[PDB]
Design a binder for this molecule. Structure first.
Ligand SMILES: [Zn+2]
Ligand SMILES: [Zn+2]
Lengths: 495, 494
């Protein structure tokens, strides 16, 4: 962006170190940065202290009927929209009555999960560049529409460079990754099959790192991940450790996700996920561990001693049949012991809970478990979806809070309807009765991308129609689903 | 009102089979559903009407919509009179100095008991106009969120003001009166009796007599006890006699808090469910609010009596209550075949509606059991419709879209990104939608809400009368200085 903007009159949640809230607050931005944030009258002094040239073109946004938030940082996300017709998706009968416990449910089917994750590379290769771009753009637009200004890929069924291109075009921030799986649990062999050379998987991530260095927007970073500790060799783990030290990067993986994980890990690898990561030298401040609930006392102590990070998705565990909240209570207990814990959406093949829905879930579920309405305050849920997530992503230098020097990444929500009436804590009303759909305005680096809940830098109808066309092509050609099953569903879409 | 055909959308019936019809239809004549099913089946029912009826048939195009039964919120309290005081409008915008209070940390049973015993005094200080203006706005919020049948389980309001508000808004209401005849005082080792049980019972009989004539089919009543802490044996035995004589449902709060059983034993010598069981109140009439802190014998009494539990998993966390995971008893009793419905409870400011509560149950019950099928989305719907109507003893008329039942239904728009390609729009609704996403509300075939707007109410007027009433009551009855109240009311974006 170019020029100064003053967003004044609303309640401003900063998610700074003090979790500061300013009723009748203001945010002054110049180009892509926040320069001043506080009470309207304090910020008005900063305006009078600008270069006259800058003040003369200052745009004033009246936000008195609005709440101002930092942009959501969704640090644990997967692009999976290519599986819309197959994965718990568009071909199910409308009735749910015949549904069965499957996949992640009932403790986890570890063989099926391992095998499914090892198949990703083959399905990515079956995708056209246009299908990748069209599906990435729509999938990432849905995140942006729900207030996500910084999105973290932790392993996607899509082409990394298609997703980088989608992020560049949409105007949002993206931490790109590659799919990394070099082992599969084969029960008929009584061993893991080493499915790939660790060094080839690491070279692919270095090729992505080289391509993202060439992007000049400052909006694209990358972070290597391992799909899941079941699908990781010692050689992949040691290589990731060496790569993240050499390039000074964050690192992400899924670990302690499922009840049946530890038993499969001991049987096939001879050791549980966190202890294998710890041996490789990966349990340290760089680590974002997805889920990380099924940890014994030694593994909890390794996470605390390393000052690691856990990303938690309490909005989506129930519908997947996962028990990564209440079966162990470990993630809330590690948060109480001073571990950084952020909130993330995870993802599915169809639209599911956004950050706003995940913030509500944490606020309900952590407080209920501890019989304590102060364990997660609404401003805690916000910090867990903004500043603390940015810290796990190692992007808190630039995003996650409204503070002088950080990027002008912010959301406006309308607070003038019955849901907000008389509440001096509009964030609380937002967690009670609002969601992703209630994000009104989205600004990234001082540029408005969304306004009145509408994209102002995209053709929403085009994003939708290209996604449906891409999904049809990929589903019929790559997934070999008959056109007879696909076309009736696409004919029912309300355009 | 005539015949209406609502066709083209996905129709959730919450009938006995939990039937769902993609490209389904609902045919209504006057106040009743006459046909529901596939569009082509229902189209046959249209051709089978009297020609006079068919000639004036109106068609609603619902092809871009999902159709639900009207939500039955069987456990609600009108508390909007406490907007400035109770966790409300005078708090600082920063939450950082908040402390565990009231229901939190196991429950402050002395403070809870004392607070509940003060209700009769505050209701008495209310004008009829204050009561009506606050009731109407409070109940409009329920209606706006898709609640077509609302159950009072003890309100800070005048019963007949709330009946009048329900009559005017066009929704269904089970009215109650406030019942508290004991308090747990810290200076005592036994309950202090505060009222004659017969006076408390006479108040409910005056309400029952006032609504007895009502011909609309929209007003019923159900006696409640506030909380078993504030109930004498004489009140309990009197309620039992009243509900037998008048053939009524019965509701109370029991096993709500960790610290309840210990206070109950210390002051009454017996826990809530056993005291209800002694009175003869643990039977099919009982809707027990919360009912999580039950030992083995009390769970057995609930199952043997075929009692009903109303659960509010949407609101436990923010109150610091642990009525879901600390015991896991409510999900376990549901698995054992006890009727369990979902309710909002209520607060003094707008909180989780039924839609938010349905999502909560769907996330939280499934996560606890590592089983995505323990509560299916259609289960969450049944728990907020047909099963709640059964607990309220109104399932004769409402709670499901079936021939003969009232034409009480909701339309939700399903044409945006949230719903795209999902053949289970209810699932997308629980993921990404809420109370605000209710588009149309029909009660007995009359449209009360359309495009998320009141059809036959001035929403700005309901708001402004509520704020006027709230100001009077807050400054006069709650003695909050005008200096604290007027700056808040001046900041309302009209
Ligand atoms: Zn994940
Ligand atoms: Zn209640």
């Amino acid at each position: 962006a170019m020029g100064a903007r003053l967003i004044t009159g609303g309640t401003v949640y900063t998610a700074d170190a003090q979790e500061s809230v300013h009723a009748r607050g203001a945010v002054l931005t110049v180009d892509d940065k926040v320069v001043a944030v506080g009470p309207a009258v304090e910020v008005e002094q900063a305006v009078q202290a600008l270069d006259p040239a800058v003040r003369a073109e200052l745009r004033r946004l009246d936000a008195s009927r609005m709440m101002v938030l930092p942009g959501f940082v969704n640090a644990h996300w997967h692009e999976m929209f290519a599986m819309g017709f197959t994965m718990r998706g568009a071909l199910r009968p409308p009735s749910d009555r015949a549904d069965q416990v499957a996949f992640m449910g009932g403790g986890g089917d570890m063989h099926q999960i391992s095998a499914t994750f090892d198949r990703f590379d083959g399905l990515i290769e079956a995708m056209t560049e246009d299908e990748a771009r069209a599906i990435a753009e729509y999938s990432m637009w849905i995140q942006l529409r729900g207030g996500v200004t910084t999105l973290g890929d932790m392993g996607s069924l899509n082409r990394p460079l298609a997703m980088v291109e989608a992020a560049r075009r949409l105007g949002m921030r993206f931490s790109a990754s590659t799919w990394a799986s070099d082992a599969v649990l084969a029960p008929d062999r009584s061993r893991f099959l080493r499915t790939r050379d660790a060094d080839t998987v690491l070279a692919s991530f270095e090729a992505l790192l080289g391509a993202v260095a060439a992007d000049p927007t400052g909006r694209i970073r990358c972070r290597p991940n391992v799909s899941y500790v079941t699908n990781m060799t010692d050689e992949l783990a040691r290589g990731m450790a060496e790569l993240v030290e050499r390039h000074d990067l964050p690192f992400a993986t899924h670990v302690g996700a499922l009840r049946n994980e530890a038993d499969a890990m001991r049987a096939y690898h001879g050791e549980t996920g966190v202890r294998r990561l710890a041996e490789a030298g990966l349990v340290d401040e760089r680590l974002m561990a997805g889920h990380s609930a099924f940890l014994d006392d030694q593994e909890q102590k390794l996470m605390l001693a390393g000052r690691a990070h856990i990303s938690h998705s309490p909005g989506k565990y129930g519908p997947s049949g996962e028990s990564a909240l209440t079966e162990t209570g470990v993630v809330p207990a590690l948060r109480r012991a001073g571990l950084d814990v952020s909130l993330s959406t995870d993802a599915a093949a169809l639209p599911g809970a956004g950050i706003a829905e995940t913030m509500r879930a944490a606020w309900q579920m952590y407080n209920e478990m501890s019989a304590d309405q102060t364990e997660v305050l609404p401003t805690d849920a916000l910090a867990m979806a903004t500043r603390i997530a940015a810290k796990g992503l190692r992007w808190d230098d630039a995003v996650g809070s409204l503070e002088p020097g950080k990027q002008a990444d912010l959301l406006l929500v309308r607070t003038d309807d019955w849901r907000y009436l008389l509440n001096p804590r509009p964030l609380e009303s937002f967690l009670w009765l609002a969601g992703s759909a209630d994000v009104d305005t989205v600004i990234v680096g001082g540029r408005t991308l969304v306004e009145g809940g509408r994209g102002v830098e995209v053709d929403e109808a085009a994003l939708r129609d290209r996604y449906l066309q891409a999904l049809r092509g990929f589903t019929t050609r790559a997934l070999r689903v008959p056109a007879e099953a696909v076309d009736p569903v696409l004919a029912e879409v309300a355009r």
